[PDB]
Amino acid sequence: VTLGEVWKRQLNMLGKQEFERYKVSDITEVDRTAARRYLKEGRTDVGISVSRGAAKIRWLHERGYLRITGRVLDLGCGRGGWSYYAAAQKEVMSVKGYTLGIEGHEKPIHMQTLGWNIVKFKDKSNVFTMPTEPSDTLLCDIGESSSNPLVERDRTMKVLENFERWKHVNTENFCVKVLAPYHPDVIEKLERLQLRFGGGIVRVPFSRNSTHEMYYISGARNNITHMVNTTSRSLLRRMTRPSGKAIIEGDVFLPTGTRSV
């Protein structure tokens, strides 16, 4: 019924070539060539990011959509690109990363970029059921894509319900993935969270056109419904006239070393 749902139905109708051409049209991409090189070698003394995902939190951080500070929780940390980025920030005290790391799911990668000494990881951890702990900064990049919209809305809702469970009164800063923001249920859940916590929803330009994902962040205020539809219209406009060409940016590179306090 919504414009986003129309986008989803049209995406599921594209052929391979149409799909591949559409998914990169006018998006932004990091050059991952250097990092792939060193990750294959197995080098831990070079200042690369363990994931493509780090580019998203850098963008949000540098643009002022969120502050990164104090005790940091990274829920669904995967390889740990959000965790290592956080640990290199001078206002950051400690970083704790939780992820599944089971069959098919990625595990934490050990790296020695700046502040590695104040990062701790735990796999075999389900953030939906495990006990919560306090934080000043709460991060969550969870939300697996699906061609089924009802699967996407269920995964999204579950992420948002768990975020509310995790958020502490000290948690002034937050960044939560919203996989399928086009669903009316998801809009209603976001509006209700916003009433309590403030903040707003944003589209990160590093997301491919083949996902409608957006991020619920703490450092901006906006109209949820208007922001979701502005992205839907944008994703629809690109589908009609796909450029096939992405913007390339330099990757997330960090210093190495330990940090004091």
Ligand SMILES: Nc1ncnc2c1ncn2[C@@H]1O[C@H](CSCC[C@H](N)C(=O)O)[C@@H](O)[C@H]1O
């Ligand atoms: N219920 C759950 N509990 C813990 N981790 C989960 C989870 N559901 C999904 N995940 C994990 O969440 C991760 C999202 S990918 C994380 C990317 C990360 N921001 C980075 O830059 O590296 C996946 O690895 C998936 O295994």
